[PDB]
Every structure is written in structure tokens, then in C-alpha cells.
Amino acid sequence: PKLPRGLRFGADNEILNDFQELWFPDLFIESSDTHPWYTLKGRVLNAHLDDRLPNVGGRQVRRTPHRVTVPIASSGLRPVTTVQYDPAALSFLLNARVDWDFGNGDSANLVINDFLFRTFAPKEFDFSNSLVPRYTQAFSAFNAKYGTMIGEGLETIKYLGLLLRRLREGYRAVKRGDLRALRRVIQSYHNGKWKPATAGNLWLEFRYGLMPLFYDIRDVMLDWQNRHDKIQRLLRFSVGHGEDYVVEFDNLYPAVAYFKLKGEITLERRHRHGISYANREGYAVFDNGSLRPVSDWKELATAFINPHEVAWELTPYSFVVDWFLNVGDILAQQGQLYHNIDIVDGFDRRDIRLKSFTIKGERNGRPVNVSASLSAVDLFYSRLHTSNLPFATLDLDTTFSSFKHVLDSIFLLTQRVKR
Amino acid sequence: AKLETVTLGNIGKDGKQTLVLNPRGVNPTNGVASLSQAGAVPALEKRVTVSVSQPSRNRKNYKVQVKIQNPTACTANGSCDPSVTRQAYADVTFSFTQYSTDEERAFVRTELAALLASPLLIDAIDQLNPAY
Amino acid sequence: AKLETVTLGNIGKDGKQTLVLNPRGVNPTNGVASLSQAGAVPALEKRVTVSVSQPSRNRKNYKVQVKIQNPTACTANGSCDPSVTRQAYADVTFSFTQYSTDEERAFVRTELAALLASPLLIDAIDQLNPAY
Amino acid sequence: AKLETVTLGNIGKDGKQTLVLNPRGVNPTNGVASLSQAGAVPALEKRVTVSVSQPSRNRKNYKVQVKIQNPTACTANGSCDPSVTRQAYADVTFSFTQYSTDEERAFVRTELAALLASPLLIDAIDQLNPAY
Amino acid sequence: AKLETVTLGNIGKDGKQTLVLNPRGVNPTNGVASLSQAGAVPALEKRVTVSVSQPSRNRKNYKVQVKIQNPTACSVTRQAYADVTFSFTQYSTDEERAFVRTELAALLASPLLIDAIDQLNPAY
Amino acid sequence: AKLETVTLGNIGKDGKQTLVLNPRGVNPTNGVASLSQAGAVPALEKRVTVSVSQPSRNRKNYKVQVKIQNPTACTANGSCDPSVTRQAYADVTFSFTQYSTDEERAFVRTELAALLASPLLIDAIDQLNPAY
Amino acid sequence: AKLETVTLGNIGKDGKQTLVLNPRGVNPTNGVASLSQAGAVPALEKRVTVSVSQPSRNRKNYKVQVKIQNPTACTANGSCDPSVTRQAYADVTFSFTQYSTDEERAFVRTELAALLASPLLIDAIDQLNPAY
């Protein structure tokens, strides 16, 4: 009651998504008239008619209420919502201008507005046989289509870990206290036998004496963020197939049995399916109230290169240890993106959309001429969540366990840094 | 906590008056729900605001702010509508952590509610007398 | 504004507990009186501070302050001394002009009380729910 | 669009009052036709300004500005005639493309008129209730 | 100021057509409510935005703004739009505000402004 | 190591603006200092980085570099976060032979200062005009 | 800027010295000014060049280049004719965004002109105080 319909509380009073309502909502019937009136303006058989009578007789559609979700992952992926709108009969307004000049004194010319008609809706259809095949091949080529980027990401993250380890060595040298031994890393960048000039200082030979290290760190962590972005974008596979289905509308008489209206309506129905992947443990209970942003990822990288920093003259130790700790925090946060990755969500959607139409008036010798434009009011749209996946999936846990291992190791390394 | 007509019954010195704050809306730019007593002059009405700040990345602490404003009439012997002369303000900001608990939240609420009625704060605000 | 023991009853979610805060020493450093749980250790845990800053250069505009603090503490399975795991606190303020009148001051008091009793603030506070 | 006596019928809250703005003239320096409430003290009259800004090589856009001001009398209890105390301004700015059609232009016209008659803007301006 | 479906009848050059404006999300970046045509596509075409900016360090002086936008296509080939800004002081009264609203409506329905909008002719 | 506060004056065309630059640190790699305005915002804080080099192997002449940033700090930007829109770069570079003199350095120094102060460089730096 | 005799002041290291700079003509082949003092040989004379560029296919900024070359002329002990022995650079580059204003432009100019007189630049240039 406190939270909106599609939400619920957790153990420690944390915002969470109510699956029972998300995937199994309470349908309800509705018969809310939208345009239960039509207006004819003009003259027919020398009779100016401008009445306004109703057109809608009875409505009935089942649908679901309004819901709210919240991302259940660091990347911000939201869960899918079960929705239904399956009108018993379709609806399409026709703002046509019927007119026809017949002999023996018989002319008609007027314009119709807010005139709709109900017709059958082909709900019974299933393209599973056509959609299921279009996953296996995609998965098989996946590794052949992105193994390159996954491998370069795996090496980039290990390179980040190596950089952080070298930085940790330098910091530990700083903490223990030594000017000459502190140059262990300094010799790892100059590519040359650098000689001293005078008596230096600990913080002086560490604040920017490691500019190549800082530049490398910034560059390759931006590199990893960029690849990361794509990689998590790569954890989703949506595919759909569309076909055309022409339909006929029953006869109708906008006037009082003065002229008949017939023709055809062109629609297409497309069946779509989308599979997703994420953690299989914390997906149900993902703390959205305590997470770090994504900007601090750039913040930490640029901090050491920032030539504006007063904490180097007040508390170097605190600032550098906080740098470590926040890096480890972000690392652990992104770690959950690769722990036990399996099918977590799945939706199947069936939707109908008009494309074209045709109109033909026939009362006596095909006297009517129609030049109208069609527009729909009600379209069949049914999107249901499903958990049964009757086909071989692409379980991407084994191919990501390495990344999880790497991030855990790096977090251990950085949390091992003490004041 | 949906908005609706709030009617404070007995309030005041002798405890006889009542207040009816009608539902204005919620400024969404800052997530602030507002309530006003029935009138016409925006400058001559008792107003109340309630706001609910979730733990930001730079804060990590739940906040509830509740404000009350009451302006004086000092209506003049003619010459136009009254003029705002004095403005009584009250502000309360409650604060907890993420693993906060309903019970001690209501506890602090009721503690302050009964403090406001105890004789200490009575003459502390009433007569402006330093707590002594 | 005499200092003494205050026993506030009908406290909490269902309004059944009671808190007895006994007086303390009025802070010379800033002229602020203090009340605390009957004790013993809770005497240095729970706090209720009350102050009334008079008109000044910064203050014009009397300023009344009330800060309530409740530290939740726990004992680990093996420890002895209780360590504070959480800290509750709320802060009420009333800023009143030099020509303010005591009737309206008490009106403000009682209005804030009746609102804190109103379901709206208990919902937004105890349950931490924006009014929507 | 010749200037002449404009008599706007029922207007206000209850829809009972009528307004009679006499035709004054046209400022040429900006091409602005002016409509004025029948009165004596130029500070005590409801005013309207109609400007038909044709397109140039800096904007290539037709414009209509219609501005309306109402001043408040706030008659003082003697000592001399009233002083301007409050002043309500309204400014409508139709921005047409040169290719515009009389049809679209009238659509915009009656559209804004109906919106200003509908309950939404009724409360959004009369009661200054934010759209929510 | 509840947001709901608005049925504007008797509009146009001869006051015959009707506009059905359903509400949308109130823009949280600046607190502005929106209404759009019944749809489907015209929803993202036609727009009516409403905001009531309360006083601030630059306002004082409430400012109620109503913007209307009509794009005409056949790709949007033309775009008409209008903007109304009422500035009201804090001591202003709802009497004043309804007077102003009703006066502006009666002006837009008066012959002069139909002449100056529809055919775009200055009062001469 | 430069740790001196510089109280500048005669800023802008009017000459009535003043500025103050407080040291922020030293970059123990290239002999660079850092100075900033009092504040907590990049756009509102003006940067001054001086740098002095000595011959090692790549060059046989000194280098005195000076980089000043005067970002344009905009007030209204959708919130109380003054951002930058126009970054004002000012880069100065010197090169002195190891057999030069403090006299020669002061000579170039004062000639630069005088040309900057004269109406010669003002027309080319502000109004952007060529040498007619 | 413009070809004219620019009467400088305070050159070298004292407030009494001055210097006059007459133009030498502009070169249409490149478009770079030249000013210097009465003489015949540039080595014996003191040169200042300025250059201004506007947005084009090369860049998108308003580049103002300034150079001041005061080479040391030796006319004895070996080189009989005036030979340049010590060369000193004065490359000052001003860059600004397309949407910058005159005051943005003059801010950096005043910054640099008064910094060159400030004590930081004086001992950074003349005495070459290290900035390690």
C-alpha cells in the first residue's frame, strides 16, 4: 500500500520489485468509451444533416494495472513487465468524405467524423517454431562475434590489476619510509638509468614522480569502462519475426441505410522474444539504496593527475587510502555483474499493427467514391513473462568466472592496503 | 502518505482553534508536498511543507523535513488588503540510516510530539524563557 | 523554563512506552539545557537539548532550538560493553520576530504537535514514504 | 482589424462583469495599437496592447503580441487619490510561420481560448495550483 | 490543478472541430505538466505544456506559463506555437486572476484579435 | 617551491576588479607550482601554473612556462552548479641561454609587462584586429 | 593592432627607464607586425612581433601570437660585425572560444601583465627560483 502496486519491501526495509505482481498481475475488464459519437456534416439527397448520434454500443477489454520497477543490477537493467490488452473487437476511426453524383436528381456530399467500427481480432497465433531456431546460431556465432572484445577486456582488467599492484608497492614503500628504495617503480617507466641530483622526499617522489603510471591507469581504466559498457549491453538477445494478415470488416451504415461501405484492412502481426542474463543470486534482492555512481570511476582516475589537490599537504595517507578503498568498492560492485549469469528474465510479446487498407462503396452500380484515411484506436498487444525456455540456452557463467575471479583478487589486493 | 485535507483539531494556547490545510500539490523539482489553509491571498495563509530525501550517494542518510509558516495579518484601517508584518517559522528535520527501524522512527516522532506539549518547551517557546 | 524530570507517556508506534528524562547541567559554553534518560548508562546515551537564543546581530528574531537524539546500541555475542550501531536524531526550530506574540507562538507549537500526530507525517516518517 | 470600442462580455470568477476599453491610438515607433479602460487617471486604467509584427530577414516569422495589464486601485482613506499597489500582467505571443494558413491560425486561437476556459488552467492560475 | 483529459470543443475558424488532450508525465527537471493529442502519433506532435513558477530570487511575482505547439506535416513541414505568461504578485487575489483569465479569453474571441491572428492584419 | 599568495589588481578593462591566488601545491617532476583563487569550483577558480626548467640533455637553454586558465563561470545552469562554457587559455613560454643575465631576463620581463599594459596588445587581444 | 610609436615605461629593472617602439611595416607575405627602437641592425635593436588569426579551416579559435626577440649583439672579441650571441624567446599565445567576450579576453591580459610585476614571476625569471 505504501509502495506503488508493483513494489514490495525486503528484509531490511529496502525497495524491491514485487515479482508476484510483475509477472502474475491481476487482470481486469474495462469498457471505457473513447469516441461513442459520430458527426455527419454536409447534404445528402437534398437534405442537410448535422446530427450527433452515438456509435459505440458495448466495449470489453482485459488489461493489467499500472506498475513500477527498479533496476536489479549495477548496469541499470530493469525487469520486464507483464501487460495485456486483448480487445474483443478492433477499432478504427474513419474520417471519410462520402460523396457521389447520381442521375435523375441524386447527389450526396458530406464528411464523417468520429465514426468507428468493430471487427474480429485474430488472437490465436504462435510463431514459436519460427523464433526458437533463431537463438542457437546466434549463440554459436556470439563467441566468434565478440570473443575478441571479451578477450581484450579480460586482458585489460588484468592489466589494471597489475597497475594497482605496482601502485600498492609504491605506497607500501612510502608507508615504511625510504627515499632510495621508493624508486623501485620509478625505474619501471623512465626506460633509463635516472640518477639523483639532491636529497628528495617521500611524498615528493610519489605525488607526481609516477606520472606515466597515473596516465596509464587513467587510460586503461577508461578503456575498461568503455568495453564494460558494451559487454553488459551484450547480455541481451531480442529477436522477432513479422508477417502480414489482411482482414475484412462487416458491413456498416453511417447513414440510415443510405449507402454501404466495404473494403479491406491490412495489418501485420509480429511475434517477438527477448532473453536476458544477469546474476542468479542477488537479482531478487538488489540493494538500490547503497551503490556508488559511475562518475567517481573517472574521478579517481583523474585525481592523481589533477594539479589541484590540497590533501597532499594535509593528509596524503588518508586521501590515497580512500582512493584505494573506493576503487575496490566500485570493483566489487561491478563484480556482481558476472556472478552466476543465467536466464533470469524472459518475455514473449505478440502485437498487431496496421499498415494499409482499402475502401469500396457499393449500393447501386458502384456509385460511391471514397478518398479517406484510416487510423486505429485499439490494437492487440499481449506481453507475458515466461520462465520455461524449451531449448539449449547460452549459459555465460563459465566464460565470466574468470572476470569474477580477477575482480575479487583485485578487491582483496586493494582492501589489503592499510593506513 | 497521499495528500489530502489535513484538519488539526484543538491547537493554541487555550486549545480551542482548529486548522484546515487544503491539498495544494507536490513541487516535483524538489519532491515537496505542500498544504495550505483555505483562503485567497497567497501572502496571508498558514502553510506547511513535507519532504522526503532518500540517501544520496554523497549523503547515505534518510531525511524528513517538515516546515510550517504562519504570517500575520496586521490589516490596516483601509487603504488596501492587509500586509505581511510578521512570519512565524517552524522547521523539523528527522534523520536516520538505511537499516533504520520503523519502531525507533515512531519512537522519535512521539518523543518530540510529547516534548512539544511538556511544560518545559511550553514556556521555552511560549514565554521565550531560557531553559533554566 | 525550569529544569526537572519529564515523564513523556504514550510513546512509540502504538503509544504505550514511557520515557523519563531527568535534568542535566545547563551548558555555559552556549547556554543550552539538557535532559537525559533516567539512567544509568542511558543517561549518557539518550539526549534532549533545549536552547533559546535571544535577539542579536545574527539573531533578530529569537531562535528556539530542540535537538533530540537516541543512539541504538548492541552487544556482540562475546563482547561486554554496548557499542552504538545506529543513531537517531531530530531537530526542531522556531524563529520568531521581536514583535511576535505568545498566542501565536503557542499556536505554532500546537500546530507542529498536531501535524506530528497527523497520519501524514507518521506515514512519511515511520514508513519513510514520500507523500504521493 | 480597425480599432474601435471593445466591449468584452462576462468575465471574472462568477462571469458577471463587463469591460469597455475605448480605442486610444497606435504607437508608430513599434506598430502597437492601444486599448484603454474608460477613466481619468492614466495609472488607474486597465490596458491592452496589440502588435502585429511582420517577418524580417532576422527572424522570418510572423508574430502577434497581446499584452494586458490591470492595476489595483487600493484606495487610501483620504489624503489624496489611490496609489498603484498591485499590477497583473498577461502576455500572449503567437509565433506563426509565414507559410501559415488562416485555418491553422484560427486553430491556435480557439485552442488557447478553450485551454484558458478549461478547469485545468482555471485552478493553475486562479488558485496557482501547480499542474499535478 | 489535476491532470486529466481535456475536451476542447468549438474550435477553429468556424468553431467546429474538437481537441482531445490527454495528460503525460510532469517534467521533473522543471516541474511542467504536459498534454498531447489523443494519439497515437499526434501525441508526440501536438503539445500543450503548463507550469506555475512560484516566487524565487529572480521571480517574485508568480509566473504562470502556458505553451501550445502544433506541428503540421505531410515529416513536419510547419510549426505554429503560442505562449502565454501571467505574472502575478504575492498579494494578488484570485478575483484578479480570474478577471485576467476571462479578459484574455474574451479578447481572443473578440473581432479584433481574430482579425489580427487569422489574417494577420494590424489594427489599421 | 613556490608557496606565496599573490594579491593581483587592476583586472579587466575597467581596472576595478581584483583577484587573489593562493598556492595549491608543487609538482615534483618538472619544477611546476600551482596557484588558485579562493573558492571550491573549477570555473570560479582561476588557474596559474608557473614552471621553471634546467638543462639536462634534450636542450641547452632554460624554459620558463606560465599557463593561466580564466574559465567563464556561468551562474544560471539549471541548478546551483556553476559550470564552464568558455575556457580562457593563456600560455607563455620563455627560452634563455645559459650565458644570459638577470639583467637580460629582467629586460625581456619588463618589456613584456609594458607591452601588455600599453594600448598596443590590448587591441589585438581583446578587439582582435590586425596591424593596419 | 596598429602601426604606431608605443611609448613604454619601466623597462629593465627600475621605474625610471623607458623605451620607444616605432613600427617597421607589415609583411603581406605572412601578416606579422614588427616594432622596434631606432637603429639599423636587428641584433643591435629590440624587436617585438604580433600576429592575429581568425576562424578558418586551420583552427576554430582567435589566436593572438606575440613574440619579443632581444638578441644580444656582440661587436668585438671575435665577431666584428653585430652577431647574435644570446637569444631570448617571448612566445605568448592567447586562444579563446568562438563565443567569448571582450572581458574574457582582457582578463588573461591583466592577469599576465600584473603577474609579470608580481614577485613570483620576477624571481622565477630573473633569479630562476626553482619550482621543484
Query: Out of B1, B98, B102, whose CB is closest to A289?
Result: B98
C-chain CB neighbours of B53 within 8 Å are none
F-chain CB neighbours of A211 within 8 Å are 29
* Residue whose C-alpha cell reads 448520434 in the numeric block: A53
Tell me how far the alpha carbon of residue A60 is from its chain's centroid: 31
Can you tell me the distance from the alpha carbon of F71 to that of F79, in angstroms, rounded to the nearest whole number? 18
Residue D132 corresponds to which cell in the numbers above? 499535478
Determine contact: E76 vs chain A, CB below 8 A: no
Can you tell me the distance from the alpha carbon of A316 to that of F43, in angstroms, rounded to the nearest whole number? 25
Asked whether the beta carbons of F130 and F100 are under 8 A apart, the reply is: no
Closest residue in F to G93 (Cα) is F91
Asked whether the beta carbons of B69 and B88 are under 8 A apart, the reply is: yes
Residues in chain D, total: 132
Strand partners, A274: A238, A347
CA distances from B49 to B26, B107, C45, C130 (A): 9, 22, 31, 12
Q: How was this structure determined?
A: cryo-EM
CA atoms within 13 A on the CB side of A286: 26
Can you tell me the distance from the alpha carbon of A325 to that of A413, in angstroms, rounded to the nearest whole number? 10
How would you classify the pairing of strands D32-37 and G73-74?
Answer: unpaired
Determine contact: C84 vs chain B, CB below 8 A: no
CA distances from A85 to A64, A387, D119 (A): 8, 21, 31
Question: For C108, phi and psi rounded to 5 degrees?
Answer: -60, -45
Asked whether the beta carbons of G118 and F33 are under 8 A apart, the reply is: no
Q: What is the DSSP string of A244-305?
A: EEEE-PPPB-SSSSS--EEEEEEEEEEEEEEEEEEESSSSSS---SS---SHHHHHHHHHTT
Determine contact: E20 vs chain D, CB below 8 A: no
**Neighbouring subunits of G (3+ Cβ pairs under 8 A):** F
Q: B13 and C115 in contact by Cβ < 8 A? A: no
Asked whether the beta carbons of D131 and E99 are under 8 A apart, the reply is: no
DSSP 8-state secondary structure symbol assigned to residue A162: H
Question: For G127, phi and psi rounded to 5 degrees?
Answer: -80, -15
Can you tell me the distance from the alpha carbon of E1 to that of D121, in angstroms, rounded to the nearest whole number? 7
* Residue whose C-alpha cell reads 579562493 in the numeric block: F38
Nearest CA to A185 out of A201, A209, A203 is that of: A209
Residues 6 or more apart from E15 whose CB is under 8 A from it? D110
* Residue whose C-alpha cell reads 594579491 in the numeric block: F7
CA distances from A208 to A220, F68, G83 (A): 18, 20, 42
**Neighbouring subunits of A (3+ Cβ pairs under 8 A):** B, C, E, F
Sheet hosting strand G47-52, strand order edge to edge? F6-11, F17-27, F32-36, F47-52, F64-69, F89-95, G89-95, G64-69, G47-52, G35-36, G18-23, G6-9
Instruction: Report the residue of E27, E30, E93 to disrupt the B interface, i.e. the one with the largest count of B CBs within 10 Å.
Output: E93
Residue D115 corresponds to which cell in the numbers above? 485551454
Q: B99 and A293 in contact by Cβ < 8 A? A: no
Tell me how far the alpha carbon of residue B103 is from its chain's centroid: 22
Residue D58 corresponds to which cell in the numbers above? 532576422
CA distances from E25 to E29, E42, F78 (A): 11, 16, 19
* Residue whose C-alpha cell reads 624587436 in the numeric block: G47
Determine contact: F56 vs chain A, CB below 8 A: no
Can you tell me the distance from the alpha carbon of B13 to that of G67, in angstroms, rounded to the nearest whole number? 81
CATH 3.30.380.10 fits F1-131, yes or no: yes
Q: What is the DSSP string of A77-101?
A: PPPP--EEE--SS-EEEE----EEE
Please give, one letter per residue, the 3-state secondary structure of C48-106. Answer: EEEEEECCCCCCCCEEEEEEEEEEEEECCECECCCEEEEEEEEEEEEEECCCCCHHHHH
The alpha carbons of chain E give a radius of gyration, in whole angstroms, of 16
Q: E11 and D131 in contact by Cβ < 8 A? A: no
Tell me how far the alpha carbon of residue D53 is from its chain's centroid: 16
Q: F2 and G120 in contact by Cβ < 8 A? A: yes
Query: Out of C11, C92, C120, whose CB is closest to B92?
Result: C92
Pick the CATH number of E1-123 from 2.60.40.420, 3.30.380.10, 3.30.420.40, 3.40.50.980: 3.30.380.10
Q: F120 and G52 in contact by Cβ < 8 A? A: no
Q: Which residues of G63-82 are buried (b: 16+ CB within 10 A; e: fewer)?
A: bbbbbbbbbbbbeeeeeeeb
CA distances from G81 to C74, F100, G41, G63, G70 (A): 93, 20, 10, 37, 17
What does the angle CA B82 – CA B88 – CA B92 come to, to the nearest 5 degrees? 145
Closest residue in D to E14 (Cα) is D106
Q: B25 and D130 in contact by Cβ < 8 A? A: yes
Closest residue in F to A310 (Cα) is F24
Specify the amino acid at residue B118. Answer: S
Determine contact: D130 vs chain B, CB below 8 A: yes
Can you tell me the distance from the alpha carbon of A377 to that of A91, in angstroms, rounded to the nearest whole number? 5
DSSP 8-state secondary structure symbol assigned to residue A166: H
Can you tell me the distance from the alpha carbon of G72 to that of G85, in angstroms, rounded to the nearest whole number? 5
CA atoms within 13 A on the CB side of A328: 19
Asked whether the beta carbons of G38 and F99 are under 8 A apart, the reply is: no
Can you tell me the distance from the alpha carbon of A141 to that of C39, in angstroms, rounded to the nearest whole number? 72
* Residue whose C-alpha cell reads 504578485 in the numeric block: E89
Asked whether the beta carbons of E105 and E86 are under 8 A apart, the reply is: no
Strand partners, B25: B34
Q: What is the dihedral of CA A337, A339, A342, A348, to 10 degrees?
A: -30
Asked whether the beta carbons of D107 and E10 are under 8 A apart, the reply is: no
Nearest CA to G8 out of G113, G120, G111 is that of: G113
D-chain CB neighbours of B78 within 8 Å are 75-77
Asked whether the beta carbons of B46 and B69 are under 8 A apart, the reply is: yes
From the CB coordinates, do chains F and G have 3 or more pairs under 8 Å? yes
Residue G93 corresponds to which cell in the numbers above? 599565445
Asked whether the beta carbons of A130 and A378 are under 8 A apart, the reply is: no
E31: region left, alpha or beta (phi > 0 left; psi from -120 to 50 alpha)? left
Residue B132 corresponds to which cell in the numbers above? 533554566
Can you tell me the distance from the alpha carbon of F6 to that of F50, in angstroms, rounded to the nearest whole number? 13
**In sequence order, what E strands does E24-122 have?**
33-37, 47-53, 62-73, 76-88
Residue B29 corresponds to which cell in the numbers above? 523539482
DSSP 8-state secondary structure symbol assigned to residue D123: I
DSSP 8-state secondary structure symbol assigned to residue F97: B
- Helix spans in chain D (H): 102-117, 119-121
F-chain CB neighbours of A193 within 8 Å are none
Determine contact: C66 vs chain B, CB below 8 A: yes
A-chain CB neighbours of B97 within 8 Å are none
